[PDB]
């Protein structure tokens, strides 16, 4: 383990577990969250709520004094954050969201407004729109390509194009699709709820090529100049073709990321295969399958992966680095795959500590410093340790469950 965990609760120093400056915008976050870097060198954070009805923004480097903005949505998005995009166009956060009813919502949030004091917003910061009939063919994945262009992926397997003409209106530019004709075979139906080989991951290469990963782990490659299927690789027929079980991916997730012209793909074989080839001209060319090192049955799920330039690790022999984030319940696992050379055959897995020192010390009773004694002493201890957001959320959960402090010295309470 070459890395350690440093936990940061951006409100820890302050008594109020919420910023005084919070603004609620309304249109006529504990399920997804991410950061995005902007023109001004500042990081903006965003959260999409459990229901996918609330979007929240706040500045990484000024969470307490800066403004957090809650944007309320009329209904949930069709398929969670997977039907949502956020990109900085020109001094604005452009946010598009296909909603459940079929609407295509556009949000325009000026950069200024995100770092201003204002609790008001002027002008058309949102546009509703119905470009296609999503009642019949339900979409599930929205992918940004450009300020005017971005594609839609459908549950049945089809791609839709979406071209912006003026500043607001969008129109379907359909792609040629003859994949459906496998319906002719006795092994597939159009009407079947199975059989769909929908896209589960997608990346844009050199502005023009659109690399898609399907539920059956096919890598298809679309040329946006042609709007034509250029490539179709079966990722699985390379390694040991197990007739027993290849788990066709049953949800959209982060199963590939590219750096320059390299491309790693996550294939499920005991949840353990990182294929990585190279792109070049368009041609994808295999190099090696790198398994994972995971035990206790292998019950970790990919959260996010990011292929990137090498780090400063204890091994100078490095060419590329894949950062990998697994999850199993609320427990997480961070690993770095180091590839040594341009052959993807020599590599090394680097693990990290997945609990902070403070937490480990508390769990393992290795804390010698924290003052002992009084019941209220323990109160100060825990309050100071955890921060007000958590401490008050915990005191909220207590009273709901009818657990109430008997007296000053209720040790049975503190235990809880």
């Amino acid at each position: 383990a070459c890395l350690s965990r440093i936990d940061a609760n951006l409100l820890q120093y302050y008594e109020k577990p919420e910023p005084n400056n919070t603004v609620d915008l309304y249109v006529s976050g504990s399920e997804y969250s991410n950061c995005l870097l902007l023109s001004n060198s500042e990081y903006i954070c965003y959260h999409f709520s459990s229901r996918s009805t609330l979007l929240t923004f706040y500045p990484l480097s000024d969470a307490y004094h800066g403004k957090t903005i809650n944007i309320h949505l009329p209904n949930a998005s069709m398929n969670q954050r997977y039907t949502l995009t956020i990109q900085e166009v020109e001094q604005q956060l452009l946010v598009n969201v296909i909603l459940k009813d079929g609407s295509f919502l556009t949000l325009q949030l000026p950069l200024s407004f995100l770092f201003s004091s204002a609790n008001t917003l002027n002008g058309e910061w949102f546009h509703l729109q119905n470009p296609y009939d999503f009642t019949v063919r339900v979409p599930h994945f929205l992918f940004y390509v450009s300020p005017q262009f971005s594609v839609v992926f459908l549950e049945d397997g089809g791609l839709l194009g979406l071209k912006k003409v003026d500043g607001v209106h969008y129109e379907p530019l359909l792609f040629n699709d003859n994949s459906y004709l496998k319906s002719l075979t006795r092994f597939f139906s159009r009407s079947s709820k199975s059989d769909y080989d929908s896209v589960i991951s997608c990346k844009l290469f050199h502005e023009r090529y659109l690399i898609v990963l399907t539920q059956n782990c096919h890598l298809k490659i679309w040329d946006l100049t042609s709007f034509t299927l250029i490539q179709d690789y079966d990722m699985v027929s390379q390694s040991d073709s197990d007739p027993s079980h290849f788990r066709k991916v049953e949800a959209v997730g982060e199963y590939l990321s590219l750096y320059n012209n390299t491309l790693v793909t996550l294939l499920p074989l005991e949840n353990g295969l990182f294929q990585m080839g190279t792109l070049l001209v368009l041609t994808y060319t295999f190099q090696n399958n790198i398994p994972t090192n995971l035990s206790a049955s292998a019950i970790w799920s990919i959260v996010d992966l990011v292929l990137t330039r090498p780090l400063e690790l204890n091994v100078e022999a490095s060419y590329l680095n894949l950062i990998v984030l697994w999850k199993s319940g609320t427990a997480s696992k961070l690993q770095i795959l180091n590839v040594n050379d341009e052959s993807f055959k020599n590599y090394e897995w680097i693990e990290s500590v997945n609990k902070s020192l403070v937490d480990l010390q508390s769990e393992h009773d290795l804390d010698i410093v924290t003052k002992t004694g009084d019941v209220e002493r323990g109160f100060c201890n825990l309050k100071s340790r955890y921060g007000t957001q958590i401490f008050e959320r915990a005191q909220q959960i207590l009273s709901e469950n009818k657990i109430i402090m008997a007296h000053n010295e209720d040790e049975e309470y503190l235990a809880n």
Binding site: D365, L366, D367, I368, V369, T370, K371, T372, G373, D374, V375, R377, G378, F379, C380, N381, L382, R385, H407, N408, E409, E411, E412, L414, A415
Partner: protein
């Protein structure tokens, strides 16, 4: 229960029986804001409910507060005249030994300033050490404070010998080992527990912090309240946290790998545990703020016994040597209460 009032302007800080010396075990001292008061406990006819009453004998004036108090084995009675030796701590942050004939202080030794503790003194204890010939060779006082120091103060035939020892944290209690004055125990605020041979590194250090059973989390701050030896050979060690968590270790046979037993008082114990002089497995602990006292049995015979509940805060308490009576100083009084079961 029988209740005996302290003088109207007397605020008690500490209460201790003279169990350390059989000649004087019916003597009770109360340290207060102007000195140390001595009472005598006698078997009246009474009803044999509480067949024990308290008679106030006298008051030793010192002119300043007394926070901790310990009789020595040197105490004696004569006809009548009481010859007393008391170790205590005063408002000037000094540690003192006062030798009296009744209320009159005939002799006084004071250890303070820079030569003394350099912060607040948290605890004191005293034992008499005799030579091979068996004259009084030394009287030894041990004390611990917030200056991260343990002080051993020996008063010998050729005069005083002073020694200081550094601590990793403030000293919160200290007590010589029963039947073996060569050994003693020192408690640090941080949970460290030292066994020490002062005649001589120091022999052993246990710690209650990492041992907390955590079936019920004892909390973030579980500052060590008290550690005391138990048994008449000092065969055991008992430690109690402010949180009420307690632990017991024995010292004999074979090899050892954990504390022998562990538990938790119903309430916090600001003053710590007061082990029974006759029943090792038993000790008393107070919820000093609401004025309740729980009685705990180490081998779980107890099942939450709370023989004492006052409607008032408890300042201090201690067992009479007989093991059935309890003396308790509250903010304005001292009670003698007899638990019928221990008779």
């Amino acid at each position: 229960s029988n209740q005996y009032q302290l003088p109207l302007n007397v605020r008690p800080y500490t209460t201790t029986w003279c169990s350390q010396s059989p000649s004087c075990s019916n003597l009770l001292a109360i340290g207060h804001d102007t000195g140390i008061t001595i009472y005598c406990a006698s078997e009246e006819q009474t009803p044999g409910s509480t067949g024990l009453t308290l008679q106030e004998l006298f008051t030793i004036q010192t002119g300043l507060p007394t926070l901790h108090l310990s009789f020595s084995s040197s105490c004696s009675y004569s006809e009548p005249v009481y010859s007393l030796f008391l170790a205590c701590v005063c408002q000037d942050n000094t540690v003192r030994l006062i030798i009296t004939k009744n209320e009159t202080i005939i002799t006084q030794h004071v250890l303070g300033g820079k030569s003394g503790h350099h912060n607040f003194v948290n605890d004191i204890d005293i034992a008499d050490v005799y030579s091979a010939d068996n004259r009084l060779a030394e009287q030894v006082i041990a004390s611990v404070g917030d200056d991260c120091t343990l002080i051993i103060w020996r008063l010998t035939d050729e005069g005083p010998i002073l020694a200081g020892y550094p601590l990793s944290s403030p000293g919160i209690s200290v007590q010589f080992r029963p039947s073996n004055p060569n050994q003693l125990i020192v408690g640090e605020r941080n949970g460290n527990i030292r066994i020490f041979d002062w005649t001589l590194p120091w022999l052993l250090t246990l710690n209650t912090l990492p041992l907390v059973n955590t079936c019920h989390s004892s909390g973030i701050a579980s500052s060590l309240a008290n550690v005391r030896w138990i048994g008449s050979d000092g065969s055991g060690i008992l430690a109690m946290c402010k949180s009420g968590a307690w632990l017991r270790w024995n010292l004999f046979g074979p090899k050892n790998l954990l504390p022998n037993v562990q538990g938790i008082s119903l309430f916090p114990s600001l003053l710590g545990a007061c082990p029974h002089p006759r029943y090792m497995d038993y000790f008393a602990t107070a919820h000093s703020q609401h004025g309740l006292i729980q009685l705990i049995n180490t081998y779980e015979k107890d099942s939450n016994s709370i023989p004492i509940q006052l409607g008032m805060p408890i300042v201090d308490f201690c067992w009479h040597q007989d093991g059935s009576h309890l003396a308790i100083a509250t903010e304005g009084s001292v009670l003698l209460t007899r638990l019928m079961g221990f008779t």
